[PDB]
């Protein structure tokens, strides 16, 4: 894409590896020059930073924009949703393609590309959820990775008699995805037990939002996480844990990474920002707004712990799992929490939450902030250094970040079409002043300047080195010597 | 049972709680008097101890005497097997009743009682393996606990398409067994994955004994253990992990007990005594003799670690899982390790192994030795203080133990009908000199004096306090307050 | 001591090992008979229990009755203090003998015996604090253990330039105490750093009670605990950690016990009952009442965690560290928290706190309650089965315990001469109805019937088997083989 | 420094963040251009890589070249030692300046600069060991950081009555070094206890090399590491653990980094390559060659574990602690191991060992290899991207690395003046083919082309962002609110 020549002067550039004062000159969707006191053509827009930070545009790895649900749709679509992202400093999103059981994955890919190409304000990629399994689906997975630029597929361990897969199915699927060089994602909760504990919570007459959290205690996440981690290690396939919510799940990932397992852990704005004490709100609707799987841990020590592990590297990248429904849609679970559609907000609040909860708190510094907001995502999904880096050659997706900025979050002001915001009234430190996506100024002085359909689908190639170099090294060590033995 | 009056003089008595020098006078299968310088009727056999230790007779909680297998039988039956037990200082055994899938559990109970009543040299109890599940089996479990004196039922997580149970089945079964007050046992290995990894190990042309261990690495035990532990905690049902073999499984039990879970861990002589490096023996038959599930960890640090955790209380009781086949029976897996019948020896070596590997090594003292050889078993299966204690009122099952004794283990000398002994050539410190079961001298000067059928079935009542007091306390804390909420 | 014949009928007896319904008949300070439907002489007082629990009388292992401090004394003396103990179900106390630096330990022993013999309502023993170190003190320690019946000596790692001992001194002292067969106790806090952090907290103008907690964060306890544990392992000497307050210290003890170290951990009523959030009270005096070393962790998750580890066996016995000062005495640290005399209440509340916080919460059962309130103390200090057990032969110190009792704690009602109670207003479940010490009824219908000086000093012999059997086994394994080597 | 124009064609460039095929053109000690198919002046030396790896030149952070010892010197001086480094792919070294107790640190700095400037084949920096402490030394530390370009100072916790510092001294020193912005290094072993255990090992007549390891078991490292970590956290000062040898020390660093402490851990070639079983060699001299503090763990699982933690990021950078003495020098401890001079080889073997033990084993990939061999060192000591990166602007220190190379290590072939090599006979995978330092070819076809004195002292500035951004963030959070309180 062609676009205006743009110079940013006097900025503190911040990447995952270092910080240094320098001017940045961008042109035609790329960063052409970086340095001090540059030779710049006249008739070119200039932005004065005054030493404010300049960082790669965020990569939200988990979104559900206009997601299908019971002949219905999430109230944030690819357009309004990407407005929310950009408003919050995020310039790329990876949305989950959810083919219906007994449906084609390729046809769901077609469905999703159409939507996002026409509506997305910013660049994007897609994950494909493997909602069912057979020879025909496997064939589609090979094609999606080869031809359609998808390197990431999620399997559900929850959702009994819907999206759930057996242990044998996980073995086959992790084996296939390891061979083909893709990132095996999991929604890691034990569906078999949750299904029972839902029926138990209803039998005790607990039909409100608190029934949701109490039906899925973090014990059932940890088990799922542990079983996934285990099967993935036996197939020598890299594992990506989606939406990490509990302290026990995060410790199992930490435990496994120390051993040497190729396991990644994605916390989301919700678990990084707030706990699940609002499931017990007197206001049904407010509590219904927090209903997502896995749930916000009622253990209020969890947010701060999750931020600690994200800082230590035991978790590597942040997402939002942005999946917003209106109160009217939540309401179809008025008298039964299992019918409440699942999902909350977070896409706009993501980067400011991490800065407030991790950076301002001294847990991590601006560089690691970049790693966990953009760069590591980019390395895992094979978008580096194209994304998540302010270097020459790299796309011109970047944010002027003010660490001294302080903004209160409210549903009045957010870009989401949700009536509620789970971070309602939270004073957060640090926010974007300016956002540049595709080299164009899409945020300045509090004003969005987006264009519908502007975003381009970025294809992601298999065998990201960050992920697959060790896996390849181990593949070529599994020569099992049988014992030389005279017969009996 | 009536039996001779017997006095033991000048002995160092050793229970789980203390040691003290005192004379013991027994009569009619009971201990009548304990003390210094006793008033004893003349014409009464006297045994001089010279200060050698006197301990409760061991309780082996895991045996498979004359176990059915493919229209066949283990070469140690209830008679010869209990000779082996007594030879090794063990005076009670709990054997596993294995009803065939789609068979009656009650009819298997009948089958097993007949065999043991007629052949057992010593007292015994029974576990009943829940090899399949439905309304009719549940009804049988209620009856077995109420009428037949069985308080312990095992479920298999391994053995795909044979004994395996789903997660939903484990929830129902742990719920039932918690309500009825029984001990939920598990063979904790992941069958779904092992089944695949067996097919993989055969595809690599590894058909010998090393194929067995490599098909079931300890990762697959840990997962099964963790999933059991988790489901058991959600049903508030006490968990008993059978045949603990790996360091990772033992740590998960230790991890869970510290949190407050009611979880018990049973190592066996095999894992306490030796590692799985002999799976790679050039001699097929010798390696085929070690084939048992879960396997001996090839990690040679495992024996010593298992003994450390048994000493610390993180494991509570020892077993043997005595399940011996002849080489000729093992041989039907000549060309395919999955057809090798599974099981090894250990019943005779149990107590001497623990003394050598734990007591002589300074890890645990004689008192904790008693706890992990008899008393804790007795407390868990509700046989305390009837068994596992030298006090007045208690059955007269006891051993004169020599800690300075040193004996080499060999197949030449063992009471087993196995050609091989997995502890062949092991010099062990500590062994029994005299054994008294039912008040009768069944071992002295290296000579067994047993009687076939002498043993009596001991019924075990549900709701052992050691296990169920906390479980009962928690049952009456699960009142879940629904939120008071005006309608929308 | 002679005393009335006393029968207790229809009680549920509860020891550390079992529970069973039986009558108890006591005479002349001992338990003569236990059983059903006993042959009892007429003209003998009878107590009807109606199935209420009967437990061994508590052993508080940590008290500072009328402790010297700057030409002053704690407001609870040996008489009023032991009234408080008995009021709370505790029938034995072990008080800390604190000889002044450069003073004789034997002369401090003489001082303390005089006081306690003349004032104690109940039986008692003594620890002796090793407040300084040299050849002459070592000689006194040998004599105290041989002649004076003291098997327990504490060293301070805190209190710089007062009671503090170097690492080299701890090596010598743990070596001596291991050889002589005594229990090495530690006040485990790092004095060197605390001393600095006190000066730092004053420089920030923080002179109130919150200065105390903030000057000694639990990091400094953990380090001291870890260093002690380490030195103790190198000298093969058993370690007893006094007054465990933090989660990190308790984990280090748990970590060490699993490895096989002989290490014991004593939580106190304060850390089992409440947290240190009341250090920030607006009311100076109330916050000054909580000032004790190590401090109550401000981390409010700590009480519940401490109770969990006490239940799991990772901590073994409870104390109170009863060391009460009046507000007027606390006040000498009005303008400087380092001058506040250290210590709080707990002796009366000890057993009820554990029942409320651990037993009623389902964490531990009545049997483990007995272990951690009396029996394990008795085993460690070599008072078993004399104390901490309702068996024939054992002293008649026992309590009728009502688990359904519910009492509110207040300074209005306590037996302490303290104006404040750190558990003020706490509704606790479970309390004593009747208490029998030395076979006499010292509590009934809310009324104390004590006698000053009644208590007898119980001598404690070295080399308790519970502690020293493993240590002895290891002593006789440290034969270090030098390598046979031809010269160069 | 001016130097030939040099082009490297057809290479696989490998940095810590990515790998990519590109040509590299160097000139005058810098990398001028990187890219495909470059515009290059004629009359310029060209090196064909054939796709072999190109990596930043290693940074050995721990060397003791011609170190003083008892009026003596290590047999590898700054010249021959840097030959060894370069032979092994290492192009920068940081040597330890060891001022004598009661000596000037500045004068030791002068001494060391003279030596290294005149002899070093490659670039270098210096650490300064704080061997004693007072007002005058502190003043020198301020000056060294401000004027002399030193940002790293080591303190000894071992070496009683020589280099040892109290806990109070560590508090002052970590406080000073935190304020001034320097890296607090520690030799973390407990000297007080080791001193005793040496005297104990001699009293048992164990005077050979095995006496050394047995006098300093890893328990005494862990404690020192833990105490350092703790004091460093209380002073908010970054900690760098030198020469990590044991599994327990590495776990304490891992434990602390997860919590959020600024703690770094430096393993050395010795602990990464081999264990301490050769302390028991019959050949005195061979065992005497392994004598270094802390010692090689006799636990043979240690090498592989250390490599695992280096891979996981729980350790960050490698060193060698190159400190070679001749057998004749070792021999002065013939009859007493405490007189054996301490230190072994490793500088030449460093990078090949890590590749063999970590990369070829699948534990870490080529990128993380770069991080732990050069880049992370460069980030911690503030030499990034000047060093440890093949980018434009960066010094031209780089190695052509062959991962398929296989070389046997021997004393016959090494560049060291040591008669022995602790890795004698070890077949290692991966080695350098070509080495370029300062843009000059210093290794090709097995031939060194060095120049004495060529190396330049690189000054290291305080407050490396990698280290100090979080520390600065926390400094400005320690505002401790005193409670507003009306007086009493």
Residue numbers in the entry:
A (entry chain A), B (entry chain B), C (entry chain B), D (entry chain A): 12 to 499
Manuscript excerpt for this entry:
The diffraction patterns of all CRMP-4 crystals of form B showed diffuse reflections independent of the cryoprotection used. Combining the experimental information from the sharp/streaky diffraction pattern, unexplained native Patterson peaks and the ghost density from shifted molecules strongly indicates that the data exhibit severe lattice-translocation disorder. However, owing to the lattice-translocation disorder the refinement was performed against DIGS-corrected data. The model consists of a dimer with the two monomers in the asymmetric unit related by tNCS. The crystallographic twofold symmetry relates two dimers which form the biologically relevant tetramer. Both monomers in the model consist of residues 12–499. Only 11 more residues, up to residue 499, were revealed with the CRMP-4 structure, which form an extended loop protruding from one protomer towards the other. The location and conformation of the three most distal C-terminal residues, Gly497, Met498 and Tyr499, were resolved for the first time in CRMP-4, but only in crystal form B. These residues extend the C-terminal loop further in the same direction and pack well against the hydrophobic Trp295 of the neighbouring monomer.
Collapsin response mediator proteins (CRMPs) are cytosolic phosphoproteins that are mainly involved in neuronal cell development. Like the other CRMPs, it is involved in neuronal development and binds to tubulin dimers and microtubules.
